[PDB]
Design a protein around this nucleic acid. Structure first.
Lengths: 1471, 166
DNA sequence: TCAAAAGTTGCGAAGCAAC
């Protein structure tokens, strides 16, 4: 076979011999079938020459009945020039071979018998021929190789991927948050060495049509094609087809000695005929081409493996979704392609981009950023019109040719189109090729088919169609169609009749569209204008679509799949914002946003951000310079970054589904420092854009001042613009000259040189270096930290806990796999060292590599969910080889060796599970479900549906969401972690491996001297935690399936899905629905647990007993306690009886049932973990003085009697009331001991004592860092928790303990309580039991009035038809909150007469506000509130500063000089 | 423009006050003045919350919201054919039938027969085993049926005869 | 940060030195 064909190759085919060897004959075998048509071709270049000479000739060679109609006679002439060009390189390669054979007598050395074909650069020589003194190429192998180069030349750039931030930083050595701008853009044209050689190598191997022997070294089955590929690229670069750019990296930073290189390939002209049918060669030399376009009955095949993950196969359920998606037919919209080509490529760039580019009036850093925007549009435009040329040649009518695309699973289970520019990715092609179609009756404007038509138009024109009813949408849409969009429609109508555009087409659209500019907004104008001129509106056919976008699909999916524990009323309200409604059948998002709540998850997080930020600012009241630094940072944000909610809403960027919002980024485990740089990059980018406006304004008028050029649009006068400029200069100087430093838990300011000075120079203004670093330090400490606290409050604390355990479990397992994999290749290589045949430089064979990979199957490296498979650690690293694969003949470019080996997971575990099971499963379920919608384009979290069936396909979208919510990512992970720990051994790991996994399992203080026993014990604890979480999630999903629910997550039409429950939860408060859900949760716990096992007046409806006051006299001495403490009970209980304290006790079922009858909030302490232990604790209601006990005893009754009395002293002292001097000292002493409690060392204490301290310190700091509660209430709660920790841990810290500081702390806190209870009278001696090991275990309930900012910010975004839906008034209120509301005192408001000067102005303004409304100016509810609040702010300011109204007076007199009665008269000639 | 100059002259005044509250309020004795301002904002914040939840209805009507609250409150304590008839009366499109009045239309459709059965039980003419709460949920159910068909569906029928949007 | 990876030459025939 192999020896039979081309048997003249130099070398001996024998495996082991002392002579020279030809390793090509052993590395590659001969496939039994046919893969390439050039295997038997003596001259492949000339054989295909007669194949591409005529249409008839091309028929026989390809063995097809008919050829592509695009392969006509016009492109025949083009291919002759290109292939003749491909004949000149073959001579260049031959010339280069001769030079190598003579340089340094390398070829002469072969005469003696040197093994020159086994060198790093000599792998190319393995296929050379013998001709005597000299050598020559094998013609068949050489001529076939250049065919792969020609095909690679045409379509290389169409398949290259996009470089990510990490890789760009990796090849640069500097983080992408600090590198200078502009060098990132250079990736657009150039590609690195490995990208170019690897892509070309694959084509050469495929064209040869040979398989790989599994028993051959990896240095020959993978190096021979690479050596050939490097030769072709070197030939091309000297032939001017490829240009090589060498970048010296020492200029930007001297320490970077690296010298990277970029390769760029020359591009053909746009009108070149080769663009019509560029894949003639590929479909001629192959049998199953991969580069193709499918027309008619052609169907793409189904992929067998994931994207860039050969070790993972596609599940049969996954393969079913691939078949359905690839069967959907697309069509080209003829009326839209005419509009694009008539406008022109240059006009498109100006309209979509930043207009015409000129370096004279553009900032240096701003100009280079716009290059990426222009590059993407130009490439997408060229690609779209190259496809149209091929389609137009297939039929007379272009709009009747189906087009099929290809999909494939990615590494996270998401379907992805194959190709860089496709309808799924490029937004330009999305408006030309669509799968949707519809037929509507628009003869009447009051029909039901006209409402669907208006829904598509309104959504495409940037209208929140999912937050208003179907009637408000029509009212708002009609205003646009007759207002600003009127001039644009008139031009569109003219185009639809004569096909021409005005000379100012670009300018007109910019004025009309405004900030609503998008590629889809141009389609809406075309469809509406096409409808007006239509003569028959009863059978209108349009491809317009409506997108069923999800509402915050990221956080919502993670909150519903990775949350455990009892249900909470706060969770119920928060989950309502995502589209889950409990006890409200047939409810939609439109009704919820109009009548219930208009705040979303993004807005809720921002509201909590300012609540915590105000608390932090108040703590530094004694440090004025610190406060001024906070204001400077916030003031700079307002000028340039009014909003922080970023995202993929840009119109000149490809859609990849990557989430960049701060809320979802923080959930995905991103570091605090990383997001600080991202926020700074947005502010600096906004500053540069303002500089371009200064230069642009200077050209128009060379006399305007700097202040008027920058802040002209927001200045009421010339003096107002000076204040804004002066304020901006001071803000930027302070931030870049002073930084905050963290000292022992308190911040401090230090000087770090000089910041920006008083010189603008807008042409060359930039911020970098020390100034840029100082900017991020202020941002991290003053804005990022409060953001984390606010995010956790909304998404729930339990969700954060579930994410931390998931990251640790996946990180530990990844390091072990990586270290073990590296420990077996070294053993195998050392084993081969005693084999004379083996030579250093090669690698293990394919069979050997698989055996090592298959040896880790017992470690469970893959996670199975029943329908999806995940491989987190899989990557194509290169450090495992540390060798050189191959190189050029002249030793110019060296290609390293890359192997597919496991790597460290890092923080990728959290986004893998959420995306893979949350959103990835929904789309897979939607495609394969019964009666799945047809002719739709689902991208990642949305879908495009035709106007005919908007209300039916949207209902099934919500059904898939419900189905995907029944999964359990934690349970799947735990099933792999448990198996991993069964067959693991930490005593055989490398010393560096133990350090890597010690950073996750252990703490900071325990990291040092970490014994291998401590590492094993710590890793076992994480497995236990994962078991409980998977149990809690499973039970919660069972309870929710038994109640009626309405799901409206992924919808904008108003067609929800009902889960057909059986328990009615309607007509109940959200606080009431939690109790019912908790009742079913507890019944499930006891049902499983039992399976494994196989005095006072009594209430009537429940078996609880009520023990009121004046009924505890007998029980005073029943406990027979010593008389020293017996007298205390008489005094303590006497005070309690004066306040009418009542006692209620019973079994857990009885005490919980009684609360539901009387509407009583319960705070019983028990969870799944506590259920196994079997401990239940009651609670105390401080508002009505009621004590609740669960399964009480005589011992615990006495403890609660003194617990309630002690807490009264703590509460009264913090409320400002006078306290006894004996009790005052005790609380004061306890406060002092509290300040030392959070600054202790625990690394030398018992492991169990660490948990007691860690849990106590978590809740203590949480109370002090709360800004929405009364300070008196928060302070009392923190001290009460301090007392509980000391008494609870006394029993076990009084023995087997050393003289540790923490152990000593327990004794001091215990002694302080003794004096407080006993007062000035004699107390029991030290070390004696207080009340038979008295403990504090019952929670305390307290409430207080909310703050002013809490109620003002709640109704800011209220909007409704009957309440008022003025969008502009909503924005005005938002800016009012920042200036005034956010700076009010956090204390709750009071009611005093408040006589004075300012109050007179406020009182007078209130009366004048009412008179205006009753004297001709009727206002709605929304407009009345804004007018009332704004006027109050202007009234108090004018009362303090008499000159504040000087400017407003000037504008008033001018208005009064042009006002007439007829201005307010609608019909001036009325009767 | 004059309107854009007026709003800019307003935020300038607000920004002047913002630079006053951000300073040392206690030292510059503006603490009492700001407290008066916060009272006005608090009072106006609660008033706008009362108007909301008072129109928490798809139709945004005072009466419609009140009826829903009473209907739900009765179902907590208590622990078809006629509806289709009233829908045809308000959906008539003949043009000449609607010109004869509504008394004639009701008689033709025999709407009075389902109505007579319910009233007889309430008065006591016909004995029945239904409790009070079952009958109250019946009378209040038919009242909402008339309002939905006549105050909401009838205007859509009239506007549907025009080929435009007046 | 949710994703493919990734310096360039001289001597000498592997791998360190130099930048």
């Amino acid at each position: 076979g192999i020896d039979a064909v081309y048997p003249s190759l130099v070398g001996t085919a024998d495996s082991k011999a002392e002579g020279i060897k030809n390793y090509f004959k052993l590395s590659f075998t001969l496939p039994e079938e046919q893969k390439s048509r050039t295997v038997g071709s003596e001259a492949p270049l000339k054989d295909v020459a007669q194949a591409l000479s005529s249409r008839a000739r091309y028929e026989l060679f390809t063995e097809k009945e008919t050829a592509n109609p695009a392969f006509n006679g016009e492109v025949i002439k083009r291919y002759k020039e290109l292939m003749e060009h491909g004949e000149g390189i073959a001579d260049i390669l031959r010339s280069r071979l001769a030079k190598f054979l003579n340089t340094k007598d390398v070829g002469k050395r072969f005469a003696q018998g040197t093994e020159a074909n086994r060198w790093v650069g000599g792998k190319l020589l393995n296929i050379v021929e013998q001709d005597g003194d000299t050598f020559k190429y094998n013609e068949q192998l050489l001529q076939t190789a250049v065919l792969a180069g020609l095909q690679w030349r045409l379509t290389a750039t169409s398949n290259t991927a996009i470089k990510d931030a990490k890789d760009v930083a990796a090849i640069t050595g500097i983080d992408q948050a600090l590198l200078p701008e502009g060098l990132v853009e250079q990736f657009d044209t150039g590609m690195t060495l490995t990208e170019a050689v690897s892509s070309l190598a694959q084509k050469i191997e495929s064209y040869w049509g040979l398989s790989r022997n599994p028993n051959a070294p990896l240095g020959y089955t993978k190096g021979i094609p690479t050596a050939m590929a490097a030769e072709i690229l070197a030939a091309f670069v000297e032939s001017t087809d490829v240009v090589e750019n060498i970048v010296d990296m020492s200029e930007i930073d001297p320490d970077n000695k690296k010298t990277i290189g970029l390769y760029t390939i020359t591009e053909l002209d746009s009108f070149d005929p080769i663009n019509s049918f560029p894949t003639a060669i590929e479909e001629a030399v192959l049998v199953n081409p991969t580069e193709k376009m499918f027309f008619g009955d052609d169907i793409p095949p189904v992929a067998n493996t994931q994207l860039r993950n050969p070790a993972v196969r596609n599940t049969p359920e996954q393969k079913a979704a691939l078949k359905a998606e690839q069967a959907t037919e697309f069509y080209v919209h003829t009326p839209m392609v005419q509009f694009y080509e008539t406008l022109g490529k240059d006009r498109i760039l100006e309209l979509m981009g930043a207009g015409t580019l000129n370096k004279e009036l553009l900032n240096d850093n701003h100009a280079k950023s716009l290059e990426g925007k222009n590059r993407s549009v130009e490439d997408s435009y060229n690609q779209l019109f190259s496809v149209i040329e091929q389609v137009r040649a297939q039929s007379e009518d272009i709009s009747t040719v189906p087009i099929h695309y290809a999909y494939n699973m990615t590494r996270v289970g998401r379907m992805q189109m194959l190709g860089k520019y496709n309808p799924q990715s490029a937004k330009l092609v999305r408006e030309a090729i669509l799968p949707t179609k519809a037929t509507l009756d628009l003869s009447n404007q009051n029909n039901e088919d006209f409402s669907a038509f208006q829904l598509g138009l309104a959504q495409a024109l940037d209208i929140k169609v999912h937050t208003m009813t179907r009637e408000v949408m029509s009212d708002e849409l009609t205003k646009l169609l007759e207002g600003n969009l009127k001039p644009a429609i008139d031009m569109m109508v003219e185009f639809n009749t004569t096909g021409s555009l005005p000379e100012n087409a670009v300018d007109v659209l910019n004025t009309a569209l405004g900030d609503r500019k998008s590629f889809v907004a141009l389609m809406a104008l075309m469809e509406y204008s096409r409808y007006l001129v239509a003569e028959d509106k009863s059978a209108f056919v349009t491809p317009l679509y409506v997108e069923a976008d999800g509402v915050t699909n990221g956080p919502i999916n993670a909150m519903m799949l990775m949350t455990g524990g009892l249900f909470t009323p706060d969770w119920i309200r928060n989950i309502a914002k995502g589209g889950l409604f409990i006890g409200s059948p047939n409810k939609t998002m439109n009704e919820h946003r109009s009548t219930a709540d208009n705040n979303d998850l993004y807005q809720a997080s921002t509201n909590a951000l300012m609540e915590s930020l105000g608390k932090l600012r108040s703590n530094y009241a004694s440090n004025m310079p610190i406060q001024s630094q906070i204001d400077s940072l916030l003031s700079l944000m307002d000028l340039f970054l009014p909003d922080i909610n970023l995202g993929e809403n840009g119109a000149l960027e490809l859609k990849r589904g990557i989430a960049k919002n701060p809320l979802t980024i923080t959930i995905y485990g991103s570091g605090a420092r990383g997001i600080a740089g991202k926020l700074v990059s947005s502010v600096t980018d906004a500053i540069y854009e303002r500089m371009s406006d200064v230069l642009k304004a200077r050209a128009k008028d060379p006399n305007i001042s700097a202040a008027m050029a920058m802040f002209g649009k927001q200045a009421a006068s010339e003096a107002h613009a000076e204040e804004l400029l002066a304020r901006f200069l001071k803000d930027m100087e302070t931030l870049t000259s002073t930084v905050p430093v963290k000292r022992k838990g308190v911040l401090e300011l230090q000087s770090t040189g000089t910041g920006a000075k008083g010189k603008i120079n807008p042409k060359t203004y930039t911020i970098k270096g020390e100034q840029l670093k100082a900017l991020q330090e202020n941002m991290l400490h003053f804005f990022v930290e409060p953001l984390r606290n606010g995010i956790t409050q909304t998404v729930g604390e339990s969700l954060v806990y579930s994410t931390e355990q998931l990251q640790k479990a996946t990180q530990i397992q990844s390091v072990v796999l990586e270290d073990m994999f590296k420990q077996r290749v070294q053993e195998k290589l050392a084993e081969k060292a005693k084999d004379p045949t083996w030579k250093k430089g090669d690698f293990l064979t394919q069979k050997e590599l698989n055996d090592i990979q298959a040896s880790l199957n017992n470690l469970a490296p893959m996670i199975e969910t029943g329908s999806q498979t995940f491989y987190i650690a899989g990557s194509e690293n290169a450090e495992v080889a540390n060798q050189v694969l191959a190189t050029n003949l002249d030793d110019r470019m060296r290609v390293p060796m890359s192997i597919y080996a496991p790597a460290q997971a890092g923080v990728a575990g959290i986004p893998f599970m959420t995306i893979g099971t949350g959103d990835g499963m929904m789309m897979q379920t939607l495609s394969t479900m019964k009666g799945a919608p047809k002719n739709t384009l689902k991208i990642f979290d949305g879908m495009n549906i035709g106007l005919n069936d908007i209300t039916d396909a949207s209902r099934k979208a919500n059904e898939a969401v419900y189905t995907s919510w029944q999964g359990n990512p934690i349970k799947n992970v735990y099933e792999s972690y448990a198996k991993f720990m069964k067959n693991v051994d930490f005593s055989k790991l490398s010393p560096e491996a133990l350090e890597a996994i010690g950073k996750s399992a252990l703490e900071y203080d325990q990291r040092e001297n970490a014994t291998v026993d401590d590492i094993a014990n710590a890793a076992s604890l994480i497995e236990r935690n994962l078991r409980n979480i998977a149990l809690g999630v499973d039970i919660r999903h069972k309870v929710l399936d038994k109640v009626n629910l309405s799901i409206d997550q992924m919808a904008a039409v108003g067609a929800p899905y009902q889960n057909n429950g059986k328990i009615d939860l309607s007509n109940m408060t959200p606080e009431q629905q939690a109790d019912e859900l908790n009742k079913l949760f507890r019944e499930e716990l006891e049902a499983r647990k039992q399976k494994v096992a196989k005095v006072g007046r009594e209430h009537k409806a429940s078996g609880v007993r009520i023990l009121s006051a004046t009924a505890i006299r007998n029980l005073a001495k029943i406990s027979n306690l010593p008389s020293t403490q017996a007298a205390t009970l008489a005094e303590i209980q006497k005070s309690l009886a004066a306040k009418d304290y009542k006692i209620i006790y019973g079994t857990p079922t009885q005490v919980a049932e009684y609360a539901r009858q009387k509407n009583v909030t319960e705070l019983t302490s028990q969870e799944m973990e506590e259920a196994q232990a079997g401990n239940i604790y009651g609670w105390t209601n401080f508002d009505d003085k009621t004590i609740y006990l669960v399964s009480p005893s005589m011992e615990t009754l006495i403890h609660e009697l003194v617990h309630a009395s002690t807490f009264e002293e703590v509460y009264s002292f913090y409320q400002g009331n006078e306290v006894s001097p004996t009790s005052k000292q005790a609380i004061e002493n306890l406060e002092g001991l509290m300040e030392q409690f959070r600054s202790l060392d625990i690394s030398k204490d018992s492991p169990e004592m660490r948990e007691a301290y860690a849990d106590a310190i978590a809740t203590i700091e949480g109370h002090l860092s709360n800004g929405f509660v009364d300070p008196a209430i928060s302070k009392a709660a923190a001290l009460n928790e301090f007392m509980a920790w000391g008494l609870a841990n006394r029993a076990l810290a009084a023995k087997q303990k050393r003289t540790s500081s923490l152990v000593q702390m327990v004794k001091d806190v215990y002694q302080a309580i003794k004096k407080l209870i006993w007062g000035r009278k004699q107390a029991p001696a030290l070390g004696e039991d207080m009340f038979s090991n008295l403990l504090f275990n019952s929670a305390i309930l307290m409430r207080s009035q909310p703050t002013t900012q809490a109620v003002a910010k709640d109704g800011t975004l209220f909007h409704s038809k009957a309440y008022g839906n003025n969008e502009r008034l909503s924005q005005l209120n938002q800016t009012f909150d920042k200036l005034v509301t956010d700076y009010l005192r956090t204390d709750p408001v009071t009611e005093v007469e408040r006589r004075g000067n300012v109050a007179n102005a406020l009182m007078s303004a209130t009366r004048l506000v009412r008179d205006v409304q009753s004297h001709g100016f009727n206002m709605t509810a929304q407009e009345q509130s804004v007018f009332q609040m704004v006027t109050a702010a202007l009234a108090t300011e004018a009362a303090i500063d008499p000159h504040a109204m000087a400017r407003a007076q000037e504008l008033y007199t001018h208005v009064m000089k042009h006002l007439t009665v007829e201005h307010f008269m609608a019909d001036p000639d009325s009767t | 423009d004059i309107d854009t100059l007026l709003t800019n002259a307003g935020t300038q005044v607000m920004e002047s006050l913002n630079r006053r509250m951000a300073g040392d309020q206690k030292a510059t004795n503006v603490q009492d003045s700001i407290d008066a301002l916060s009272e006005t904002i608090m009072a106006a914040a609660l008033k706008r919350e009362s108007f909301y939840d008072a129109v928490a209805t798809p139709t945004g009507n005072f009466i419609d919201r009140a009826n829903q609250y009473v209907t739900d409150s009765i179902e907590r304590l208590s622990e078809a054919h006629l509806a289709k008839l009233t829908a045809a009366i308000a959906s008539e499109k003949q043009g000449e039938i609607v010109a004869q009045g509504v008394m004639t239309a009701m008689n033709q459709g025999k709407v009075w027969q389902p109505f007579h059965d319910l009233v007889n039980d309430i008065v006591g003419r016909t004995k029945t085993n239904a409790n009070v709460y079952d009958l109250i949920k019946l009378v209040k159910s038919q009242i909402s049926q008339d309002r939905q068909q006549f105050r909401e569906h009838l205007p859509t029928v009239i506007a549907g005869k025009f080929s435009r949007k007046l």
